[PDB]
Amino acid sequence: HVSFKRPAWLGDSITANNGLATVHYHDILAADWDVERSDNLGISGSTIGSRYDAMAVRYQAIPEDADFIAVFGGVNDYGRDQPLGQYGDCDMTTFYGALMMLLTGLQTNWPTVPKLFISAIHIGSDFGGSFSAVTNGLGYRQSDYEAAIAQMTADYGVPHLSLYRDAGMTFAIPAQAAIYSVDTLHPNNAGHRVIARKLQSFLDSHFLEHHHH
Amino acid sequence: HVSFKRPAWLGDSITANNGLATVHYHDILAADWDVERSDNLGISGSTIGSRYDAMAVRYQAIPEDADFIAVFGGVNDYGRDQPLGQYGDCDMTTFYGALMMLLTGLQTNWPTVPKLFISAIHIGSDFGGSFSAVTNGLGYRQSDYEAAIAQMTADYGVPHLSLYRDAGMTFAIPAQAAIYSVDTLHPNNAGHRVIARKLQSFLDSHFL
Amino acid sequence: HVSFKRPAWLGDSITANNGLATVHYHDILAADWDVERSDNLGISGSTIGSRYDAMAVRYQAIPEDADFIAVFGGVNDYGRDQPLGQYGDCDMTTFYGALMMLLTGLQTNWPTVPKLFISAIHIGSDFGGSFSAVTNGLGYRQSDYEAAIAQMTADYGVPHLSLYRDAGMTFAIPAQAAIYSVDTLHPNNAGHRVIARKLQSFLDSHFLE
Numbered sequence: 355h356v357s358f359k360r361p362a363w364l365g366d367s368i369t370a371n372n373g374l375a376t377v378h379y380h381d382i383l384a385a386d387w388d389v390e391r392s393d394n395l396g397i398s399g400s401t402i403g404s405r406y407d408a409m410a411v412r413y414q415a416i417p418e419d420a421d422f423i424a425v426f427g428g429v430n431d432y433g434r435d436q437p438l439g440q441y442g443d444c445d446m447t448t449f450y451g452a453l454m455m456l457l458t459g460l461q462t463n464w465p466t467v468p469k470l471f472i473s474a475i476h477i478g479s480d481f482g483g484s485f486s487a488v489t490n491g492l493g494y495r496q497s498d499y500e501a502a503i504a505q506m507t508a509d510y511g512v513p514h515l516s517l518y519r520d521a522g523m524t525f526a527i528p529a530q531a532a533i534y535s536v537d538t539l540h541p542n543n544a545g546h547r548v549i550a551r552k553l554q555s556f557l558d559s560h561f562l563e564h565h566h567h
Numbered sequence: 568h569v570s571f572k573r574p575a576w577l578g579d580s581i582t583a584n585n586g587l588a589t590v591h592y593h594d595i596l597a598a599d600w601d602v603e604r605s606d607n608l609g610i611s612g613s614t615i616g617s618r619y620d621a622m623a624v625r626y627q628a629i630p631e632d633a634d635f636i637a638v639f640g641g642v643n644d645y646g647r648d649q650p651l652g653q654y655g656d657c658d659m660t661t662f663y664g665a666l667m668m669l670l671t672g673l674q675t676n677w678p679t680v681p682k683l684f685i686s687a688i689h690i691g692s693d694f695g696g697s698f699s700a701v702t703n704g705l706g707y708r709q710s711d712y713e714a715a716i717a718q719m720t721a722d723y724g725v726p727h728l729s730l731y732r733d734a735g736m737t738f739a740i741p742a743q744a745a746i747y748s749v750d751t752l753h754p755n756n757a758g759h760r761v762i763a764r765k766l767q768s769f770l771d772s773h774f775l
Numbered sequence: 776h777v778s779f780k781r782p783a784w785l786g787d788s789i790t791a792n793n794g795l796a797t798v799h800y801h802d803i804l805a806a807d808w809d810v811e812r813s814d815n816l817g818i819s820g821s822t823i824g825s826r827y828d829a830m831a832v833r834y835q836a837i838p839e840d841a842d843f844i845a846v847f848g849g850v851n852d853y854g855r856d857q858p859l860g861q862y863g864d865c866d867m868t869t870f871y872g873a874l875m876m877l878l879t880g881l882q883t884n885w886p887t888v889p890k891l892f893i894s895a896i897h898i899g900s901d902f903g904g905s906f907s908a909v910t911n912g913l914g915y916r917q918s919d920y921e922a923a924i925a926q927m928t929a930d931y932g933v934p935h936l937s938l939y940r941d942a943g944m945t946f947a948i949p950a951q952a953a954i955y956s957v958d959t960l961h962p963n964n965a966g967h968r969v970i971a972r973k974l975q976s977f978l979d980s981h982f983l984e
């Protein structure tokens with residue numbers, strides 16, 4: 355089974371300790387892995403791009419001896435109206451540009467460390483602002499950001515776990531939002547248990563070197 | 568190995584216990600999983616769309632207490648000329664809209680139940696009519712219906728097993744249609760074993 | 776773990792025992808699998824298309840009794856400026872058409888045999904010629920060839936392992952090129968160890984038994 359001793363978790367409120375859910379996916383995994391330490395770099399509301407506490411800069415706070423790096427972002431870039439930009443952009447002003455710098459930063463400074471990118475579940479319309487099941491204030495769909503992550507991660511060889519495509523649920527359906535989410539955006543504790551299971555499966559199927567007994 | 572005790576199988580002829588192959592993929596997995604019950608909701612000729620016994624309506628025959636739901640459709644939508652439509656349709660007269668009605672109904676009524684969509688093998692041309700290895704009567708490739716499935720399932724978070732891209736075979740190639748199919752459309756018992764194998768390892772990959 | 780007793784490896788300089796790497800990915804796997812034989816059909820500088828020792832023709836050297844077939848090509852097609860063509864092409868003169876020929880051939884002749892295509896790691900620019908981290912002599916990105924492999928394999932139901940996407944590395948990043956490659960094109964021994972792992976993982980999630 356895949357486990358790590360010094361994981362680092364870069365993300366937004368779904369990763370941040372300050373959460374509406376008391377038990378996060380990484381708290382489940384850190385316990386199962388019996389980690390030496392688990393570095394939480396989640397900040398509520400954070401985007402990958404320039405708009406709010408850019409992950410494309412905050413990544414530089416990841417510990418030098420991290421043995422695993424996970425990035426869990428994009429839902430705020432969608433919901434808080436980060437311009438999407440275009441494939442080939444290389445500055446943090448756009449979502450595409452900010453992914454490029456994030457991905458270059460990670461591969462330059464932790465060349466041998468296993469990494470994955472996690473993108474969020476399809477959100478509902480009940481949170482507020484431009485957090486919609488349909489389009490954000492700039493008129494893009496969540497799946498446009500989700501596609502940007504898939505395209506950009508590919509160019510750097512970084513595996514991409516899409517909770518959007520494969521989590522088994524969408525918060526745009528009330529019956530599932532009621533069971534797995536706090537507010538059609540943030541997973542509750544049940545949603546986090548699901549995410550932990552999805553992440554472990556993904557790691558098992560993509561990272562053989564880091565199988566242990 | 569992942570297993571389920573009360574699976575429900577929503578599909579067409581490849582699922583229905585009424586024809587050319589005596590042993591289906593879901594028979595193989597029922598035996599392997601030692602199920603309590605295995606609900607066969609296959610109807611021959613059935614489309615996901617409005618044209619024939621719409622699965623986008625028939626999903627409602629799924630038992631309240633199913634603990635796994637697989638949907639295996641699309642091949643009739645292609646071969647019996649269901650209008651494809653486009654992304655953003657919400658009406659069952661198109662394949663895109665029908666997919667939306669179906670996936671909506673699944674997640675509403677079984678929010679906690681593991682489910683997956685299975686896409687069919689690339690077919691050959693021996694069955695006739697619009698069941699062609701090239702294009703159907705509307706000018707679409709089988710792969711256009713495949714992409715529709717891949718796109719719609721993604722919006723709903725529903726894992727997608729593409730036998731089309733991953734089965735290791737195509738019925739458009741005679742050497743493989745002769746081994747694994749009855750007629751270049753329907754898998755034979757050997758084809759159903761392959762399907763069962765691919766499903767089982769997909770499950771192992773995506774479920775704990 | 777999924778293992779095979781008589782695998783055949785069709786590819787370029789990354790597969791060929793000509794190469795600058797002493798222990799290739801298939802050498803590692805042959806040793807894990809306890810093989811009866813392990814057929815190395817790598818030819819250095821080889822393309823899938825017509826230009827240099829076309830795999831779309833050479834695949835016929837694969838042994839009749841192969842119990843597994845991997846095709847590991849495309850990088851020379853990109854880097855040596857093989858015309859990409861378009862979806863639906865049929866000649867070996869284009870990349871799309873050569874892929875079609877290769878796939879028809881493999882599925883016709885080895886219908887019951889498990890098989891997969893492996894796509895190359897993102898290359899850097901220090902090798903030379905059109906082996907660029909940006910675009911080839913024809914204006915194409917490496918990912919255009921990678922997208923061709925994705926589409927074509929799918930039409931024949933052949934699983935595709937994209938090392939480009941999923942390897943955890945790119946040789947366009949110097950920090951990773953210095954560790955995992957000989958020259959930003961060819962993986963070194965540490966690079967082949969990583970490839971062996973990804974291949975083994977991919978085999979376990981797409982195949983039973």
Ligand SMILES: [Mg+2]
Pocket residue numbers: 916917918919920922
């Ligand atoms: Mg490209």
Ligand code: NA
Pocket residue numbers: 519520725726727728
């Ligand atoms: Na899926």
Ligand code: NA
Pocket residue numbers: 785786787788789790791817847848
């Ligand atoms: Na090769």
